[PDB]
Amino acid sequence: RYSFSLTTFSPSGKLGQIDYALTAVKQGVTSLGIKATNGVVIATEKKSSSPLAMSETLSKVSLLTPDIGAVYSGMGPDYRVLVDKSRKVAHTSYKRIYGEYPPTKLLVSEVAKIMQEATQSGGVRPFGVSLLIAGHDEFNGFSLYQVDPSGSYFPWKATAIGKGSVAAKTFLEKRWNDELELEDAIHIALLTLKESVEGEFNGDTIELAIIGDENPDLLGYTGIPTDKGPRFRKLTSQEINDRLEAL
Amino acid sequence: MSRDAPIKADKDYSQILKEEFPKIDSLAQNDCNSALDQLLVLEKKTRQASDLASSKEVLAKIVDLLASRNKWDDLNEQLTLLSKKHGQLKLSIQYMIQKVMEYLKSSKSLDLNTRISVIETIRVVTENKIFVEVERARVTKDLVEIK
Amino acid sequence: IGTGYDLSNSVFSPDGRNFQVEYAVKAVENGTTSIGIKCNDGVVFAVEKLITSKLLVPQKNVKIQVVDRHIGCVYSGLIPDGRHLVNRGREEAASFKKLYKTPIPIPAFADRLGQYVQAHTLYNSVRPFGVSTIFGGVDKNGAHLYMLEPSGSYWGYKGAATGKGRQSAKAELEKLVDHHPEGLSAREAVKQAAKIIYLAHEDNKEKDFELEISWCSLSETNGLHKFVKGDLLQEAIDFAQKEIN
Amino acid sequence: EVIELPLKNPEIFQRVGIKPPKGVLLYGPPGTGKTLLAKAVAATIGAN
Amino acid sequence: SAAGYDRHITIFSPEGRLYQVEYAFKATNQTNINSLAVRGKDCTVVISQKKVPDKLLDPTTVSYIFCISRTIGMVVNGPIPDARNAALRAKAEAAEFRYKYGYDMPCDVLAKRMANLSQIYTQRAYMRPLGVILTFVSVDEELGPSIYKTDPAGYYVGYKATATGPKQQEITTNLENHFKKSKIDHINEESWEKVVEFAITHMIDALGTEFSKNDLEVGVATKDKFFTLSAENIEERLVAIAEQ
Amino acid sequence: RNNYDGDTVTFSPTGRLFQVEYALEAIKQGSVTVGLRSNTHAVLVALKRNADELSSYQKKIIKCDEHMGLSLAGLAPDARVLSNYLRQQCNYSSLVFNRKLAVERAGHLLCDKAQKNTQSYGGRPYGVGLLIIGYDKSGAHLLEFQPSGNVTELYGTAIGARSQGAKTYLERTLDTFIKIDGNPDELIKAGVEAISQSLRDESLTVDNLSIAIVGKDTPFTIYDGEAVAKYI
Amino acid sequence: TSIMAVTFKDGVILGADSRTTTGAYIANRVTDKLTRVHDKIWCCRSGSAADTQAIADIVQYHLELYTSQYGTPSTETAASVFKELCYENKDNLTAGIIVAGYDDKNKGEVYTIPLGGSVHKLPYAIAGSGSTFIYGYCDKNFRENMSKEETVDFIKHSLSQAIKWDGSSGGVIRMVVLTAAGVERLIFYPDEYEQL
Amino acid sequence: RYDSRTTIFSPEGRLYQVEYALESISHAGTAIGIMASDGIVLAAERKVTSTLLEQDTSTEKLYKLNDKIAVAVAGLTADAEILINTARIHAQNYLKTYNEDIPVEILVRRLSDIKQGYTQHGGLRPFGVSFIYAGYDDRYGYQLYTSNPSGNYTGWKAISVGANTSAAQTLLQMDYKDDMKVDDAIELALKTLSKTTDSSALTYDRLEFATIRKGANDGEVYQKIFKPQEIKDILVKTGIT
Amino acid sequence: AVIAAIMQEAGLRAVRKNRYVILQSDLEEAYATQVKTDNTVDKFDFYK
Amino acid sequence: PGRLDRKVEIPLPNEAGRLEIFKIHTAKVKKTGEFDFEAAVKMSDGFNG
Numbered sequence A: 001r002y003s004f005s006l007t008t009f010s011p012s013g014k015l016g017q018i019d020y021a022l023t024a025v026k027q028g029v030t031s032l033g034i035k036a037t038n039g040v041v042i043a044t045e046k047k048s049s050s051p052l053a054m055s056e057t058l059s060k061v062s063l064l065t066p067d068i069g070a071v072y073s074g075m076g077p078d079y080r081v082l083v084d085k086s087r088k089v090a091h092t093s094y095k096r097i098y099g100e101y102p103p104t105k106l107l108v109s110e111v112a113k114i115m116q117e118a119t120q121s122g123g124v125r126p127f128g129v130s131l132l133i134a135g136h137d138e139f140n141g142f143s144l145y146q147v148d149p150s151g152s153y154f155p156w157k158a159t160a161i162g163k164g165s166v167a168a169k170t171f172l173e174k175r176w177n178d179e180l181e182l183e184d185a186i187h188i189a190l191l192t193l194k195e196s197v198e199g200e201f202n203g204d205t206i207e208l209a210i211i212g213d214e215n216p217d218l219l220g221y222t223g224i225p226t227d228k229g230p231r232f233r234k235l236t237s238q239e240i241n242d243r244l245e246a247l
Numbered sequence B: 001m002s003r004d005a006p007i008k009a010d011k012d013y014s015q016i017l018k019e020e021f022p023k024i025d026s027l028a029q030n031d032c033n034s035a036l037d038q039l040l041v042l043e044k045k046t047r048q049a050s051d052l053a054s055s056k057e058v059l060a061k062i063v064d065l066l067a068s069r070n071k072w073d074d075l076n077e078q079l080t081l082l083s084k085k086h087g088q089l090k091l092s093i094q095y096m097i098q099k100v101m102e103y104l105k106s107s108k109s110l111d112l113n114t115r116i117s118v119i120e121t122i123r124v125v126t127e128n129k130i131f132v133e134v135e136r137a138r139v140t141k142d143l144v145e146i147k
Numbered sequence C: 001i002g003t004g005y006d007l008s009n010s011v012f013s014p015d016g017r018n019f020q021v022e023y024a025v026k027a028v029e030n031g032t033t034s035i036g037i038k039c040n041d042g043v044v045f046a047v048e049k050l051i052t053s054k055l056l057v058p059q060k061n062v063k064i065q066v067v068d069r070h071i072g073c074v075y076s077g078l079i080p081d082g083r084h085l086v087n088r089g090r091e092e093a094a095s096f097k098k099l100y101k102t103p104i105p106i107p108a109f110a111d112r113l114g115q116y117v118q119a120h121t122l123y124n125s126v127r128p129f130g131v132s133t134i135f136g137g138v139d140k141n142g143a144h145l146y147m148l149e150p151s152g153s154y155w156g157y158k159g160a161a162t163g164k165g166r167q168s169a170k171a172e173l174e175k176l177v178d179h180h181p182e183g184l185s186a187r188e189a190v191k192q193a194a195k196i197i198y199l200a201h202e203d204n205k206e207k208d209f210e211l212e213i214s215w216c217s218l219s220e221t222n223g224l225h226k227f228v229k230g231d232l233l234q235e236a237i238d239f240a241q242k243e244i245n
Numbered sequence D: 001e002v003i004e005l006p007l008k009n010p011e012i013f014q015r016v017g018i019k020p021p022k023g024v025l026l027y028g029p030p031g032t033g034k035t036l037l038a039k040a041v042a043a044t045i046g047a048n
Numbered sequence E: 001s002a003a004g005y006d007r008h009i010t011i012f013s014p015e016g017r018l019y020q021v022e023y024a025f026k027a028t029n030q031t032n033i034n035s036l037a038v039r040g041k042d043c044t045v046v047i048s049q050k051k052v053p054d055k056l057l058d059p060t061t062v063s064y065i066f067c068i069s070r071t072i073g074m075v076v077n078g079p080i081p082d083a084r085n086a087a088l089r090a091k092a093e094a095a096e097f098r099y100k101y102g103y104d105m106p107c108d109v110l111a112k113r114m115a116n117l118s119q120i121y122t123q124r125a126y127m128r129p130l131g132v133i134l135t136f137v138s139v140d141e142e143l144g145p146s147i148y149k150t151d152p153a154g155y156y157v158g159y160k161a162t163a164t165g166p167k168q169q170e171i172t173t174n175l176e177n178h179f180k181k182s183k184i185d186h187i188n189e190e191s192w193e194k195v196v197e198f199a200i201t202h203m204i205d206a207l208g209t210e211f212s213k214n215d216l217e218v219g220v221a222t223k224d225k226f227f228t229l230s231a232e233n234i235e236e237r238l239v240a241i242a243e244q
Numbered sequence F: 001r002n003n004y005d006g007d008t009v010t011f012s013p014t015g016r017l018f019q020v021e022y023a024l025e026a027i028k029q030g031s032v033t034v035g036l037r038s039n040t041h042a043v044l045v046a047l048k049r050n051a052d053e054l055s056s057y058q059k060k061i062i063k064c065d066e067h068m069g070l071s072l073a074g075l076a077p078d079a080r081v082l083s084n085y086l087r088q089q090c091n092y093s094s095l096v097f098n099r100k101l102a103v104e105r106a107g108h109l110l111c112d113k114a115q116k117n118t119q120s121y122g123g124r125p126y127g128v129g130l131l132i133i134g135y136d137k138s139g140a141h142l143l144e145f146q147p148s149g150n151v152t153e154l155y156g157t158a159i160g161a162r163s164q165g166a167k168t169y170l171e172r173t174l175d176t177f178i179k180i181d182g183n184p185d186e187l188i189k190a191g192v193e194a195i196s197q198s199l200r201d202e203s204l205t206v207d208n209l210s211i212a213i214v215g216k217d218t219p220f221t222i223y224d225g226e227a228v229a230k231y232i
Numbered sequence G: 001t002s003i004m005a006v007t008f009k010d011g012v013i014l015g016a017d018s019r020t021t022t023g024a025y026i027a028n029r030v031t032d033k034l035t036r037v038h039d040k041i042w043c044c045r046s047g048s049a050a051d052t053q054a055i056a057d058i059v060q061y062h063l064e065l066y067t068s069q070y071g072t073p074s075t076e077t078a079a080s081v082f083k084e085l086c087y088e089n090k091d092n093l094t095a096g097i098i099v100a101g102y103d104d105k106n107k108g109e110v111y112t113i114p115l116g117g118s119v120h121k122l123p124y125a126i127a128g129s130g131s132t133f134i135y136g137y138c139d140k141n142f143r144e145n146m147s148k149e150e151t152v153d154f155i156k157h158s159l160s161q162a163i164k165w166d167g168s169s170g171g172v173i174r175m176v177v178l179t180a181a182g183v184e185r186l187i188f189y190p191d192e193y194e195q196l
Numbered sequence H: 001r002y003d004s005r006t007t008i009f010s011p012e013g014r015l016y017q018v019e020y021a022l023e024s025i026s027h028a029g030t031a032i033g034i035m036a037s038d039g040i041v042l043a044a045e046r047k048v049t050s051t052l053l054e055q056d057t058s059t060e061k062l063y064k065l066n067d068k069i070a071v072a073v074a075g076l077t078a079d080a081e082i083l084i085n086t087a088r089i090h091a092q093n094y095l096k097t098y099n100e101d102i103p104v105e106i107l108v109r110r111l112s113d114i115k116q117g118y119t120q121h122g123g124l125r126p127f128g129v130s131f132i133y134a135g136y137d138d139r140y141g142y143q144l145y146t147s148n149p150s151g152n153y154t155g156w157k158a159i160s161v162g163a164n165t166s167a168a169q170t171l172l173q174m175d176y177k178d179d180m181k182v183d184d185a186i187e188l189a190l191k192t193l194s195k196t197t198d199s200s201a202l203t204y205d206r207l208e209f210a211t212i213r214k215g216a217n218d219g220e221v222y223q224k225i226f227k228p229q230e231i232k233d234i235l236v237k238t239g240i241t
Numbered sequence I: 001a002v003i004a005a006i007m008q009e010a011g012l013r014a015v016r017k018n019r020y021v022i023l024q025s026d027l028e029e030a031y032a033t034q035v036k037t038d039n040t041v042d043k044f045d046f047y048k
Numbered sequence J: 001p002g003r004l005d006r007k008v009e010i011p012l013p014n015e016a017g018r019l020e021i022f023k024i025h026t027a028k029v030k031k032t033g034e035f036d037f038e039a040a041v042k043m044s045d046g047f048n049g
């Protein structure tokens, strides 16, 4: 009986709607994040269950702000709204209070806060997804965080989520080092993900992006050296191929 | 093929142009291709049983075509083209292919003509899988005997 | 079919239906026969209004209503549920006159109505409407006649029927279309409209009816809606009596 | 293909080494005439 | 199974997927029509079947293909009620984007705002999800021919060609074999007309049935424009097929 | 079946609503009143109940306006609400349009009120039938209100408990009383005759009658006691 | 800023002066005042600049929907949508808009909306601060249903007079021809019209 | 039963929802406040762990609400997030209004009221958070409270909420003294934690700590969340490592 | 289990072709049929 | 596995499958000449044999 409100607790505690939401997450695609000391690499694989469907149309790697991207595992529809609501809160709360994009630590709290509301009301369901959010800021360095449909956030050095989580997680535990390059971290990433699938593994269907060091290329304006380009950069298929060939 | 009136209506069309058959037959000596096209109008239609309407015309025509030493090449291209484009029911267009075997097998108009011609027939109906997959046997025996 | 899924009008069944919305159609079946006959220069509406107690005043209760002043509506099903739907149709038409300063297009009207039925199948405290509404008229683009089902679905029609005697009603309606390729002249489509409802009143034989026929005609009402009355209605009655015997 | 092939020759299935395949579940709404088809299959083989 | 919560889209299953949201994917075969859209090299063609079971209906009001805004089409599969509401929303959205942001709304931005709107309908309990698959077609100001299929869950994904309906799988395989053998992702025909002809050819093949000029409705996107063709313009294309 | 009767926003398989049918049953359970009319006059005659014989009755006739007024049968709570709303409509007509509100239009607004609560969650079908009379430009009219909201113009009708004996009677004399015109007295007489046959195990008293008349040149007036003792 | 719209047999040609004035300074030399709100309905703007601008876009939104939902709009229809906004914002906005458009069933129609808001079917309209000097010229020299060339000449002359007598008129002489043939732009330079 | 709303009562005048919400707090990690008459120490145990969980750069159950009162967290973290933010705003709102910092007793009362409101009113969950409050205000000196999720508070000289509540409380009161010392208090939290926890390592990665002292400087009040490398250093001294 | 079923369809098709042994075409066709995992999400493709 | 290994699904007779079914039946009973089978099949859409 305690399952089906959000209002009913079990005798043992906890709410079911949060528990069942976590079940949902784990059905979604295999996505993983590794924190490095000069980057963060965030990676997922993609499908469409029909080759007719194009694969750029989907985006499962989205820059949230120019310095902070995110992925998911879980239900597709829920991601797309929640990223819209997050960009929109990012401006309200912090791009009018700093006049630029918020630090990573801040924005984790704000997105986690929309989850908290989608549990608080009854007759409104949680969101179906768990995010990884990785970004970089000027005071806490490079960073990685997990934001659960619970409305709780957890800081992570490395984690994985989704269908291949349990296997990916033990591979990460062993293979991670405390000091890795951005470049080495990409190789641990492609490889980890290749556990989840083989023979249909190619750079076309694998989306893999980074938050590294500034790029002056995607800044789009030049002559003002007192602002930094996007820390986020999305890598293309052909570039992922260079790294997959090099393995 | 739904309703019995539209098949009849193509037989009327077929019948009027069968009177004119001696005129069609005259234009076949000038050039074989010219004579085929007037008949192709009635056989190539969206509706089926149209080479069962037009059965009366191609029965006579494929004898002249067969019998000549050049016209049987344009005959084979015609037989393959009906298969692919329409291929109507399981007995329709399939009849014209079948009638070619009867006349061909008995006649032996030349030995060179007969030997290649049979290959041409068997080719298309390996691909097919209906009523001329049964008739496939007929022309595969004839060919194998010569070899 | 199964238990549940009926109860609430936004619960989808394991069958890909919404049962509550079907159950409405069944309520419309029980209602009194209505038809619309489209023409190449008018629209005709006729309706079967049963008289169920003979202390009723004759020619005084109607399920015919006018909307704006150019569009006829007539409903089957539950009567007061049908009055509310034509009522929201009057507010919409009227709003339309202030904003755009023109009579409603008949397809424009149909769009607005179709949305209102869809909204009362869209919540959990509203009720799905248990009515069909045949309606239409004649406008800038000639005559159009539409029929709105209680599922929130509508289409244009050369002939529309709803009600009890609706199966009989469709058989005669089809005949009209085949013998008359132009789509039957509007005048004669009044006399025809009476006869079709007379044949439909034999599936309801127990109760008396009163025949009310109204029209909208480019030719014989100047593109305005008005009821058919006096000697004209009398002819339609006399014709219908003739051809049923 | 299921029944008729290995019955005439178990001999080909034995060359490959993969088992000759048996067991067919017939299903479909009633009145399909699948019991009539039971007869038609075995009518070809002349099987009892 | 059952218990709660095929009665609610705001209450999860022990599976983790909402059973009533899955029923909207079983409510899409309700009117038994099939759609095909393919991409040309400056046009998009979309064709869906027309059923007029009785002579009472006028085949001119029976359609599922809609003009959404100047450059934007949509074909709907599934019921008429959710079809109108979706179409309206889309008409309103297209119109709004322009006064806010200036120029013609791309196929992608429309599809995405309607997808986000579908997801909201499932978020709240006081609104149910829609019961339609929407297949939008446009030729884009800067991306050219584009097909975006937005499903009633709030999922949206693009296409090279797509098909929808109850006989979908047959059209889908038909298309796989075709686009694979050519070794391209487009049809290489350079007029809108010979792309409409090819589409006709392929739906006839896949379903396996000859259709008539009273059983097709065809909408054609060219760049900067959208139109729906009448029955007599549709015949020109048919007689082109019927004798080549 | 009988389980779809829980609420008003839900339909049954054959398609009804059990709540509207139930609101309908209530009319019968209450009071009895018999309405009838003539080309020149409209008259309502009704039985008033009292709890016991230390009770001094509860009136069932509500003067709406000086040209409209009604009787009730079923739930007294329900009635107080619909009458108050109707009174608002007559004053509105007077105020803004300078016009004695027509009986035909009036019933239709009453119908619109009824349906608001039938559609909605919360509310309830109104638990009362009303017989509305008035005399406007178009003469007398008599309307029969239902819990569904259907409004029905009659020469004579009756509702409430065991009211069919008035309906059998009225049917018999129908055309008889239609001819009666220019004579208010005789329509009161006919009306007393109709509600007598309906009664059984009770007969009329001075304080059981409330006779409500509006005619050609008379306003609406509710008569009581010694103005109903010429027709006791 | 004289703007006008004149009927003729095959249509309507809307005419304009592209001067835009904020006091004695010319704010911009060349700004067409003929702003399309639909494909075959176009509109003219005079009075306060900002107010007309605001209103115009609001009209395009109504007619974007009218096309989308209910099929082709009309000029009549369109001019009513002006009349609604101006009349409700008679105390905040001042817009002198001539709406004209070409129907295939009513031919060319011109409806002027004055500053309070009304609708007035008329063969011809002049509105603005530059029209109040050419009233005399226009009535006398006008005749209904000219042929296009003759139509061009009359419009051309009137707006050229308006620059001569009103200092808030000037820039290039714009016309937008709304015909069955399409929409045609026409433009004319001062070297040509000062003489004529 | 009488689970089904939170605005119901039961035949015994219990409410299952208040009991169930209470048991939620014994699902989440130990949290301990020990008051001494030379400081209050807050110590808490984590409820999550693994070699790739970061927990060596972060606190997540020690929040300074304002600048003289802080809380330890026990219960759900989602429930916790909103009420911590509300509590910090009201503590600090007082700051603005009266231009002196909020007293301990008022701020706990305020937040208990908010808690209670979710049970009293609407169709909402109660909030399943037990906050240990440690403050200083110059009216009563050092103050220790904890608030129940029922939404009431009682003062304390030592308390333990969070997992293994019963065991911890027994452990604390065996070795506690009224005279005490702040340094003996730190050692006492570390003593209790070894036993209570189900992890036998009990190393820095599992441990949070903050000590609030007015003996830190003189006339001044200092809230110090210790950093991870201090938490390690004190584990040698008590000898657990 | 998945491997036992691939070899099962591999030998069956061989017999249809009237070949006596498996044989890379028989292995390849049978591989792609019954890969297993994701084969009911084709219409529920909101899942990824 | 090893008892049932293959699944053969049986669906309905098709639009031109329904046609054949009439023919077997008419022969089996007595008739005076019937020919309306082209219409009758459309009426009998979706029937089992």
Ligand SMILES: Nc1ncnc2c1ncn2[C@@H]1O[C@H](COP(=O)(O)OP(=O)(O)O)[C@@H](O)[C@H]1O
Pocket: D029, D030, D031, D032, D033, D034, D035, D036, D037, J021, J024, J048, J049
């Ligand atoms: N394909 C068919 N050809 C002819 N008769 C058929 C056909 N299919 C079905 N029938 C008819 O239906 C009858 C019942 O089928 P039966 O084999 O008893 O079915 P099930 O087990 O599916 O109920 C048959 O005996 C035959 O008359």
Ligand SMILES: [Mg+2]
Pocket: D034, D035
């Ligand atoms: Mg059987």
